[PDB]
From Swiss-Prot, chain A:
Chief subcellular location: nucleus
Biological role stated in the UniProt entry: Involved in pre-mRNA splicing as component of the activated spliceosome. As a component of the minor spliceosome, involved in the splicing of U12-type introns in pre-mRNAs.
Organism of provenance: Homo sapiens
Protein name as it appears in the record: RNA-binding motif protein, X-linked 2
Keyword Ubl conjugation belongs to the record: yes
Record key words, sorted: Isopeptide bond, mRNA processing, mRNA splicing, Nucleus, Phosphoprotein, RNA-binding, Spliceosome, Ubl conjugation
Transmembrane annotation, as ranges: none
Gene: RBMX2
Cross-link annotation Glycyl lysine isopeptide (Lys-Gly) (interchain with G-Cter in SUMO2), location: K8
A GO term, aspect molecular function: RNA binding
Subcellular location: Nucleus
SS bonds (residue pairs): none
From Swiss-Prot, chain E:
Quaternary structure note: Identified in the spliceosome C complex. Associates with U4/U6-U5 tri-small nuclear ribonucleoproteins (U4/U6-U5 tri-snRNPs). Component of the minor spliceosome, which splices U12-type introns. Interacts with SKI, SMAD2,SMAD3, RBPJ, RB1, PABPN1, MAGEA1, SIRT1, FOXN3, U2AF2, DAXX and ATP1B4. Interacts with PPIL1. Interacts with VDR and RXRA; preferentially associates with VDR:RXRA heterodimers. Interacts with NCOR2. Interacts with MAML1. Interacts with NOTCH1 NICD; the interaction involves multimerized NOTCH1 NICD. (Microbial infection) Interacts with human papillomavirus type-16 (HPV16) E7 protein.
Function description: Involved in pre-mRNA splicing as component of the spliceosome. As a component of the minor spliceosome, involved in the splicing of U12-type introns in pre-mRNAs. Required for the specific splicing of CDKN1A pre-mRNA; the function probably involves the recruitment of U2AF2 to the mRNA. May recruit PPIL1 to the spliceosome. May be involved in cyclin-D1/CCND1 mRNA stability through the SNARP complex which associates with both the 3'end of the CCND1 gene and its mRNA. Involved in transcriptional regulation.
Covalent cross-link Glycyl lysine isopeptide (Lys-Gly) (interchain with G-Cter in SUMO2) as placed by the record, residue numbers: K26
Record's protein name: SNW domain-containing protein 1
Record family assignment: Belongs to the SNW family.
UniProtKB/Swiss-Prot annotation, chain I:
Post-translational modification: Phosphorylated on serine and threonine residues. Has no effect on subcellular location nor on homodimerization. Phosphorylated in vitro by CDK2. Phosphorylation enhances interaction with PPP1R8.
Domain annotation HTH myb-type: ranges: 1-47, 48-99
Function recorded in the entry: DNA-binding protein involved in cell cycle control. May act as a transcription activator. Plays a role in pre-mRNA splicing as core component of precatalytic, catalytic and postcatalytic spliceosomal complexes. Component of the PRP19-CDC5L complex that forms an integral part of the spliceosome and is required for activating pre-mRNA splicing. The PRP19-CDC5L complex may also play a role in the response to DNA damage (DDR). As a component of the minor spliceosome, involved in the splicing of U12-type introns in pre-mRNAs.
Residue numbers of the full-length protein present here: 10 to 108 of 802
Effect on the protein of changing W44G: Abolishes DNA-binding
Organism: Homo sapiens
UniProt protein name: Cell division cycle 5-like protein
Disease linked to the protein: A chromosomal aberration involving CDC5L is found in multicystic renal dysplasia. Translocation t(6;19)(p21;q13.1) with USF2.
Family: Belongs to the CEF1 family.
From Swiss-Prot, chain K:
Subcellular location(s) per record: Nucleus matrix; Nucleus speckle
Region ranges (Necessary for mRNA 3'-end cleavage and cytoplasmic accumulation): 1-115
Span list, region Necessary for DNA and RNA-binding: 1-115
Domain PWI: 16-115
Post-translational modification: Phosphorylated on multiple serine and threonine residues by DYRK3 during the G2-to-M transition, after the nuclear-envelope breakdown. Phosphorylation by DYRK3 promotes disassembly of nuclear speckles. Citrullinated by PADI4.
Signal peptide limits: none
Protein name: Serine/arginine repetitive matrix protein 1
Family designation: Belongs to the splicing factor SR family.
Record function comment: Part of pre- and post-splicing multiprotein mRNP complexes. As a component of the minor spliceosome, involved in the splicing of U12-type introns in pre-mRNAs. Involved in numerous pre-mRNA processing events. Promotes constitutive and exonic splicing enhancer (ESE)-dependent splicing activation by bridging together sequence-specific (SR family proteins, SFRS4, SFRS5 and TRA2B/SFRS10) and basal snRNP (SNRP70 and SNRPA1) factors of the spliceosome. Stimulates mRNA 3'-end cleavage independently of the formation of an exon junction complex.
Length: 118, 55, 109, 56, 49, 112, 105, 154, 99, 756, 115, 112
């Protein structure tokens, strides 16, 4: 199923969690106390790291960023990884940015378990 | 430590400062404010329904 | 920021019979450019008016503002039009030739 | 406007029931209708103008 | 001189209020229930909480 | 004043700034922030309607002068109950006068 | 059934899979719509037992809780030989009651 | 190929300050405001007076040659497309008794327009605010038209 | 509204029971209230309601009165012997044929 | 400073109570549902036994349709292109005459006002700025204006106006000489159907059903379909209109042939919508319309949608086609398919063809076997195509086929395998997910030897992907594991060693629980693993999470444990495992933020699986029961009571007479609880107890019991009425002697009114 | 199949239709070569409908493939796409052409033998 | 329109606070409140038709309530006419205030 449905997934997941009113320590985020890396997908093929960091600083400082562009033509592949300073910031970003429309392209945001350093 | 200095960072659960070069405009699904408002209104209806419990 | 039912097509009731189209073009004129205006003729339609702005924005402005206007001792009913059906074919011939004009005109393909 | 006005005046003219008695309340005003307050405050202001006199 | 070309925050200088203030109480009738006097409406909190 | 201050900061003013005030003032400052503030902007003469209620509602109402909404709640009695218990002797002293120790709930906190 | 004439049955070849009824509907014959003297078992069409529908109330559509039987009459006049009695139309009643529900509460 | 930078890109800028397919360079700062005193603009062209414009109604006013997005199209080809911004700003002041006050003040600002904005026939600094006072005169580029600013009691 | 069956039951019930116990009466028909029975009887049913067209003199009186005592129909209608409903609609009708 | 009060910090509050419109649950994907408009009257070809065509009728035929579509698409491309060199677009006058209905005269009032109109946009903002006391003068126009229809007519809402507007004015029927217009008028009884009391609805519906053919299609649909296009349609209104459209469809049988495409253009959204009953309705009525209008009509009419640009209509078409093929039988429609799938113009056609086949298999299921070969031939040509979307969707098709044609048909798939197994090694991302779903379903259809080799091959790749984060990746691997590693022809420790550790590490997460489907899927897959490997290992893996907080998580774990021991039985467990099991059960029970049958049933089934080996634990069971039974109730009381109900069997057979007489009398004490939802469950327990401990041994001697019972019968609440009656009957039937004739006759006249 | 309240529009149309004249000589396809015939059909329809319609083409082709095609059913099934009278025509010109190729020895029709 | 109507409705629906017993007319009025609560524009149409046409109404019932020192009347209007009057009254006060009809010295005022 095409990825915008995979944004629908995470947003439904959040709202269901609030719907059952479940406590934060057992909130689905809790399984990643061990990661400051969050995946961005669906970025337009134009955004560079300047704009990405600028916008996503809104919840903290960024330790690292890796934007996978195709090396042969250098051009952005439209998805990236982001290492925030403190897990809580990534929780906030996953909550708030999952589904924002940038240049028409609705970007999807998520946790990352085992970020691979390339 | 260049720190955000611009006008007004909206509140969060953790109330953390936006980054050094935060482009400085609010782009957010609003889910923050939704959860805040619902957070207050839960307490509101708690009080309102208690007042009935004693009646 | 627009509720997507808004349109440059407005539908108006409670119209004084034999009002001057002049008067009326003015009324709706303070709001924006009028692409066109039509009034009913048969006794059923006599007294109702479809008014078409050339811009969605003047359209919404008008519909929200003049709504409930007192003209000639009566309040005016305004509404957004649901142009949800059609009454004629689209004239393949004229469409095709004007598009041939366009294509050879800007040498596209 | 005259339509509201006639509504109010006419409503103040009704048949007053109590287990067997009746009549039509055609002189006074029925304090109990939801807008008796506006009428009373009006009639007040009128008699106020009578006591004070427009100048004062 | 002003640096321009920045992304516009659609913000006014007028005072706003943060969402934690609002909606701290809901209801539209007097709390007195039309002068009802059988009901226990003296305080508004549980003595324990 | 605080309004002008939050303007000069362009910052929005929070609940701390009002915590002291939260319930003083004759319109009971916390009336600004109810859920319904907006409709209740369009209620007028609520005071004179509350008077003339006596001619439609049968029972008699002792609070005819005020309304809990547009006027806040001008009295607060949480201290009174506390100081009563205090001068009755505390929860232990009181319970001595009743069947509490009988039913032997191991503690009174569960009094519901 | 004999009560809403707008209802339809599968009417293909019977099979070997037995038929089951919801706890709600249970206790009745499927056709003569009585409540007595169960004699013989129901059998259902292969399709009407395919898929998720393994073990569904023939009538109510819900969970299988018990077996479905045939009254003595229907088996005496041999109305029990018309293949799957599986009702392949949901019917207006369930729809309308659910809709009025969603409206009310 | 291109190495990944950390520099900017108009994306957010474009979408946020874009209109009608014609991106505007200027943003209203937070002290955008609307005045109590009703300001009027008296246009003239070589001693020929032109009808007054009532510009107390918006906080920002775009003047230029592009009739689409501009508030006021000043039709001198020596006028750039997006030229100058009239702006009401709530600027603080001191009341004579020392208590701090603010008044809605009319300020003009140029977007680096081509040929220069003339304040009482002085060319002003671009991308910078300049207050307008009673009776003052304005001229943009080398247009044959000039303007005098007043308000109701002025 | 009222249907001729409820109407007839009303006639009979009244002539039996007298005009004073509307509770018993309204208990009789379903979807009818004692207040409604009382109103309907005094308004339409009771024999004293004179059901004919307006004389010229009756319309003279009506018009003249409704000019004398604006909008007070329960005050007028006894003076010309019809119900408030009759006086009201019929004055409306005269006013419309005039204009 | 009342200025401060006038200043409102940060609209009608009936939103709490007014019913929802489907315009709310909509997304942008359904947002296309209204931007569709009705077309010009369409021409029936089958007129007059196949009449010869009269020209100049403006009745659109297939030729006009396809030409109109060609112009649309091409012009869209040209618009996109002229964009590259450089809904608000202005229109034409012909465009307007296609917008507006009849009976309206066009006007430019002056040439000066039309020139003022020229200045209108000109400099609108710049203008010269914009009362007192004045008596009034009496006039009647306000009284004159009317806003509701006159008669026994339902209230007419403010937005249904532009539809029903005619009903506002009045005119005599004879003067309505256009007797078709008379028909239209009386047809606007539709409003009575829409809004109105149940009797209005019934009478109107009969009216229209039986006057249907008298009215005829043209008017009927021309005045119905605008409604269904309303943005402000609520639920009732919609299902009502579909009710009617159905009934008139059952009367007009052929006359619809000109109106099919309209009917679909409106019904289609019901095929894709979150309501269940809406889907089933729309599907059924398209079946009926397909049966009514002849096949050739359906085919010829809804071909041009295959190619249509917007995917919304492509998708909804594919679904509709599948329905009609179910109605008219596949072998009829098959050739048309074969054509579409091997279309050559543009690949969207091919994609929609393959989608059709998918939806057929999904819908009809095992009715497919006799055609499986033909279908697979139709569809496999996309398995290899260089386009990416066609490859993915084709694989999904194959998987749907297989899951329908379970065990059978493998000789028909044999042709397609290798391309699957080719693509499986060397694909990445999406195609991998699809091809995995396909081979997954195929495996059980295979034969134990062929299949065993194939299996042990695939489980290699499978292992690799447990850790992928992509959602559908995870879901597909779930279902696949279920099938392959749930096959007869595999081995215990292979699974036990290589599969179980990663499986349980990765898949048991709270994010799974919060999803809806993943819940079911994971439960079933774990269950399968159990039925292969035996319980002890699996259970011992997931027992402890019973003592997790997260409630949905506990719910899932207990519901699994339950279904497991429902299959496998409790033959296995050691002492300590059961210790932890019991404790987790109690703990989970000790928190029920919802009423949830799940944990209750879990308990009962766990016990009745354990058999007597539970006996040690009884008192704490009872201690729980009792503290619960008293605790501040609503839920927890009747909760515990239900538990008692289901546990009676064991808690008697293990001979707790002190406890038994306890429970008996203790309940007997509660019989006064003023909350029915509890009192019911009490009586239910009592029934359960009695059904094991025979009559003459009850500690509340039945003679004492029953007089306590008779007064509850007046309870008027459903649950209490029922449970009490059932108990009383069980007693009157079995015990039945310990009672008086007086008691009976009292219950006699006490029963007489329960029939309400 | 399941319902007897809706009428089989196959039988109905077969009754009320106006057919062509020579559609009754049975025809098999084994006696025939096809890829000779096709371009005739291609150009013919491309003319009738004045553009190219791959799905209509392949529709006729697949209709033609079974050992015995039904000219009545193919007439009907085409009636939708064509003018309806153009259907009976196009049939009244094909069906005999199949007769020709089937009486031929090679399986090739006579007009395309002269051609 | 809707702001007013909800105000009036809350006002009416107040009286039945205790809601323990009930009476026929009372229960009828509860129903009327609720139905009007579902379809505002329905109620508003009915209301305006009233203010436009009817000039002859039903009859009100009187009874005295007793304060032991001087009786005071207490009326009762029919439910439909109740609702209509309630609305009309909110409206009149809202305007009259906005347009400053009642000068300051007419003083059961809203502010104090
Ligand atoms: Zn039977
Ligand atoms: Zn079957
Ligand atoms: Zn059932």
């Amino acid at each position: 199923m095409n990825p915008l449905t995979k944004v629908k997934l995470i947003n439904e997941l959040n709202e269901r969690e609030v719907q059952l009113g479940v406590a934060d320590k057992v909130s689905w985020h809790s399984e990643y106390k061990d990661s400051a890396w969050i995946f961005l997908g669906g970025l337009p093929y134009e955004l560079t790291e300047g704009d990405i960091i600028c916008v996503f600083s809104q919840y903290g400082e960024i330790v690292n960023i890796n934007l996978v562009r195709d090396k042969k033509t250098g051009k952005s592949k439209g998805f990236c990884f982001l290492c925030y300073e403190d897990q809580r910031s990534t929780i906030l970003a996953v909550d708030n940015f999952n589904g924002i429309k940038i240049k028409g392209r609705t970007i999807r945001v998520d946790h990352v378990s085992n970020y691979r350093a390339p | 430590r260049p720190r955000y200095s611009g006008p007004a960072p909206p509140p969060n659960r953790f109330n953390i400062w936006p980054g050094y070069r935060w482009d400085g405009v609010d782009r957010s699904n609003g889910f923050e404010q939704k959860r805040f408002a619902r957070l207050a209104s839960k307490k509101a209806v708690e009080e309102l329904a208690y007042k009935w419990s004693v009646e | 920021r627009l509720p997507p039912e808004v349109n440059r097509i407005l539908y108006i009731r409670n119209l004084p019979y034999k009002i001057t189209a002049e008067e009326m073009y003015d009324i709706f004129g303070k709001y924006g450019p009028i692409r066109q205006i039509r009034v009913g003729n048969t006794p059923e339609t006599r007294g109702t008016a479809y008014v078409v702005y050339e811009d969605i924005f003047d359209a919404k402005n008008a519909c929200d503002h003049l709504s409930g206007f007192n003209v000639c001792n009566r309040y005016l009913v305004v509404l957004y039009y649901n142009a949800n059906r059609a009454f004629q074919k689209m004239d393949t011939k004229k469409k095709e030739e004007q598009l041939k004009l366009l294509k050879e005109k800007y040498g596209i393909n | 406007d005259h339509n509201i006005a006639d509504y109010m005046t006419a409503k103040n003219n009704v048949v007053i029931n109590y287990k067997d008695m009746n009549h039509t309340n055609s002189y006074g005003i029925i304090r109990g209708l939801q807008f008796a307050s506006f009428i009373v405050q009006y009639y007040g202001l009128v008699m106020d103008l009578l006591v004070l006199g427009l100048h004062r | 001189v002003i640096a321009l070309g920045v992304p516009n925050p659609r913000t006014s200088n007028e005072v706003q209020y943060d969402q934690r203030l609002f909606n701290q109480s809901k209801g539209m009738d007097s709390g007195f229930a039309g002068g009802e006097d059988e009901i226990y409406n003296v305080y508004d909190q549980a003595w324990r909480g | 004043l605080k309004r002008q201050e939050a303007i000069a900061q362009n910052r929005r003013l929070t609940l701390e700034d009002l915590e002291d005030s939260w319930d003083r003032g004759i319109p009971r400052i916390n009336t600004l922030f109810q859920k319904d503030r907006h409709t209740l902007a369009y209620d007028k003469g609520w005071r004179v309607r509350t008077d003339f209620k006596q001619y439609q509602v049968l029972k008699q109402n002792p609070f005819w002068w005020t309304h809990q909404r547009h006027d806040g709640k001008l009295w607060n009695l949480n201290n009174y109950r506390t100081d009563m218990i205090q001068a009755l002797g505390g929860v232990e002293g009181i319970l001595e006068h009743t069947l509490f120790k009988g039913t032997y709930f191991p503690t009174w906190e569960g009094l519901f | 059934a004999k009560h809403h004439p707008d209802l339809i049955f599968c009417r293909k070849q019977a099979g070997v899979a037995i038929g089951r009824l919801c706890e709600k509907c249970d206790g009745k014959c499927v056709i003569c719509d009585s409540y007595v003297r169960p004699c013989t078992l129901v059998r259902i069409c292969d399709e009407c037992n395919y898929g998720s529908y393994q073990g569904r109330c023939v009538i109510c559509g819900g969970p299988g809780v018990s077996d479905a039987y045939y009254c003595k009459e229907c088996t005496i006049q041999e109305k029990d030989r018309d293949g799957c009695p599986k009702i392949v139309n949901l019917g207006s009643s369930k729809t309308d009651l659910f809709y009025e529900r969603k409206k009310y509460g | 190929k291109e190495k990944p930078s950390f520099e900017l890109s108009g994306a957010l800028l474009e979408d946020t300050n874009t209109f009608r397919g014609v991106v505007i360079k200027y943003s209203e700062p937070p002290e955008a405001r609307i005045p109590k005193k009703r300001w009027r603009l008296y246009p003239f062209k070589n001693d020929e007076v032109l009808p007054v414009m009532y510009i107390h109604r918006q906080s920002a006013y775009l003047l230029g040659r592009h009739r689409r997005i501009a508030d006021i199209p000043i039709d001198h080809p020596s006028c750039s497309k997006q030229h100058a911004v009239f702006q009401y700003r709530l600027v603080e002041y001191t009341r004579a008794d020392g208590t701090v006050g603010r008044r809605v003040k009319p300020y003009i600002i140029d977007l680096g327009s081509g040929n220069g904005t003339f304040l009482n026939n002085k060319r002003i600094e671009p991308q910078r605010y300049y207050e307008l006072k009673e009776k003052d005169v304005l001229k943009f580029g080398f247009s044959s038209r000039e303007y005098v600013l007043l308000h109701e009691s002025s | 509204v009222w249907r001729n069956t409820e109407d007839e039951i009303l006639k009979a019930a009244v002539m039996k029971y007298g005009k004073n116990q509307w509770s018993r009466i309204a208990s009789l028909l379903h979807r009818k209230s004692a207040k409604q029975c009382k109103a309907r009887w005094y308004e339409w049913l009771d024999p004293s309601i004179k059901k004919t067209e307006w004389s010229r003199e009756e319309e003279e009186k009506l018009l003249h009165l409704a000019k004398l005592m604006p909008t007070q129909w329960r005050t007028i209608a006894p003076i010309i012997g019809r119900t408030a409903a009759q006086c009201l609609e019929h004055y409306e009708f005269l006013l419309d044929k005039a204009a | 400073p009342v200025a401060l009060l006038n200043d409102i910090p940060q609209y009608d509050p009936f939103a709490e109570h007014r019913p929802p419109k489907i315009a709310d649950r909509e997304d942008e994907y359904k947002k296309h549902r209204r931007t569709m408009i009705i077309s010009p009257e369409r021409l029936d070809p089958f007129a007059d036994g196949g009449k010869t065509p009269d020209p100049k009728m403006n009745a659109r035929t297939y030729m006009d349709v396809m030409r109109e579509q060609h112009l649309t698409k091409e012009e869209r491309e040209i618009r996109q292109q002229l964009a590259e060199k450089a809904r608000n677009r202005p229109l034409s006058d012909e465009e307007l005459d296609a917008m507006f209905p009849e009976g309206y005269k066009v006007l430019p009032p002056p040439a000066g006002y039309v020139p003022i109109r020229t200045p209108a946009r000109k400099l609108t903002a710049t203008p010269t700025p914009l009362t007192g006391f004045h008596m009034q003068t009496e006039d009647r126009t306000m009284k004159s204006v009317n806003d509701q229809p006159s008669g026994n007519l339902p209230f007419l809402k403010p937005d249904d106006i532009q539809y029903f507007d005619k009903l506002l004015v009045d005119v005599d029927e004879s003067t309505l000489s256009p007797e078709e217009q008379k028909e239209r008028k009386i047809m606007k009884l539709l409003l009575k159907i829409k809004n109105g009391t149940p009797p209005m609805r019934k009478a109107a519906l009969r009216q229209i059903t039986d006057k249907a053919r008298e009215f005829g299609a043209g008017p009927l649909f021309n005045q119905i379909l605008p409604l269904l296009m309303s943005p402000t349609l609520e639920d009732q209104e919609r299902h009502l209109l579909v009710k009617v459209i159905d009934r008139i469809l059952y009367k007009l049988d052929d006359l619809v042939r000109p109106y099919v495409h309209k009917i679909l253009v409106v019904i289609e959204p019901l095929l894709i919508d979150e309501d269940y009953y809406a889907r089933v309705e729309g599907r059924e009525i398209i079946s009926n319309l397909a049966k009514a209008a002849g096949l050739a009509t359906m085919i010829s009419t809804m071909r041009p949608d295959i190619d249509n640009m917007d995917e919304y209509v492509r998708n909804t078409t594919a679904r509709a086609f599948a329905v009609v093929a179910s109605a008219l039988g596949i072998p009829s429609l098959l050739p048309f398919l074969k054509a579409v799938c091997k279309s050559k113009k543009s690949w969207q056609a091919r994609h929609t063809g393959i989608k059709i086949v998918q939806q057929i298999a999904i819908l009809m299921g095992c009715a497919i076997l006799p055609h499986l070969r033909s279908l697979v031939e139709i569809i496999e040509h996309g398995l290899v195509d260089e386009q990416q979307k066609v490859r993915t969707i084709s694989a999904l098709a194959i998987a749907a086929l297989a899951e329908a044609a379970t065990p059978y048909g493998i000789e028909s798939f044999d042709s397609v395998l290798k391309p699957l197994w080719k693509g499986i090694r060397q694909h990445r991302g999406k195609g991998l997910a699809a091809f995995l779903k396909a081979i997954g379903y195929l495996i059980p259809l295979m034969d134990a030897e062929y299949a065993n080799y194939y299996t042990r091959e695939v489980m290699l790749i499978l292992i690799r992907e447990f850790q992928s984060p992509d959602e559908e990746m995870k879901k597909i691997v779930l279902k696949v594991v279920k099938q392959c590693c749930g096959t007869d022809g595999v081995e215990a420790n292979y699974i036990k060693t290589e599969i179980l550790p990663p499986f349980f590490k990765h898949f048991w997460q709270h994010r799974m629980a919060l999803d809806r489907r993943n819940y079911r899927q994971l439960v079933d897959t774990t269950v399968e693993l159990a039925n292969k490997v035996g319980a002890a290992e699996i259970i011992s893996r997931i027992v402890d999470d019973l003592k997790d907080e997260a409630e949905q998580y506990r719910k899932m774990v207990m519901e699994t444990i339950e279904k497991i021991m429902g299959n496998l039985g409790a033959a296995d467990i050691d002492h300590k495992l059961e210790e932890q099991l019991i404790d987790g059960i109690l703990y989970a029970f000790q928190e029920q933020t919802t009423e949830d049958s799940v944990m209750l049933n879990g308990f009962g089934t766990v016990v009745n699986a354990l058999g007597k080996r539970v006996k040690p634990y009884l008192p704490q069971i009872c201690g729980t029961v009792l503290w619960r039974l008293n605790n501040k109730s609503a839920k927890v009381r009747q909760q515990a009571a239900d538990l008692i109900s289901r546990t009676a069997v064991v808690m008697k057979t293990c001979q707790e007479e002190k406890l038994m007489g306890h429970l008996g009398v203790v309940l007997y004490e509660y019989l006064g609880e003023e909350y029915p939802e509890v009192l019911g469950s009490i009586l239910g327990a009592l029934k359960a107890i009695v059904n094991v401990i025979g009559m003459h041994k009850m500690t509340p001697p039945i003679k004492d019991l029953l007089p306590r019972l008779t007064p509850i019968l007046k309870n008027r609440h459903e649950k209490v009425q029922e449970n009490c009656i059932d108990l009383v009957g069980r007693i009157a039937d079995r015990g039945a002697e310990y009672v008086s004739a007086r008691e009976w006759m009292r219950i006699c006249f006490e029963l007489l009114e329960l029939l309400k | 199949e399941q319902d007897n309240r809706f009428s089989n529009k196959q039988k109905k149309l077969l009754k009320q239709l106006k057919f062509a004249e020579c559609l009754e000589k049975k025809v098999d396809m084994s006696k025939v070569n096809l890829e000779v015939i096709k371009p005739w059909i291609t150009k013919r329809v491309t003319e009738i409908l004045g553009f190219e319609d791959d799905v209509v083409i392949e529709f006729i082709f697949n209709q033609l493939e079974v050992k015995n095609p039904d000219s009545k059913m193919m007439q009907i099934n085409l009636t939708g796409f064509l003018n309806g009278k153009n259907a009976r025509e196009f049939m009244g010109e094909l069906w005999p052409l199949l007769l020709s190729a089937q009486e031929n020895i090679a399986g090739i029709p006579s007009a395309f033998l002269e051609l | 329109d809707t702001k007013l109507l909800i105000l009036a409705l809350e006002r009416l629906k107040e009286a039945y606070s205790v809601k323990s017993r009930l009476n026929q007319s009372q229960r009828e009025e509860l129903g009327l409140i609720e139905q009007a609560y579902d379809n505002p524009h329905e109620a508003l149409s009915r209301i305006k038709r009233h203010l436009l046409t009817q000039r002859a109404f039903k009859e009100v019932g009187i009874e005295f309530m007793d304060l032991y020192s001087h009786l005071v009347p207490v009326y009762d209007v029919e439910p439909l006419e109740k609702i209509t009057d309630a609305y009309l009254d909110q409206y009149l006060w809202y305007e009259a205030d906005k347009r400053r009809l009642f000068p300051p010295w007419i003083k059961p005022a809203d502010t104090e």
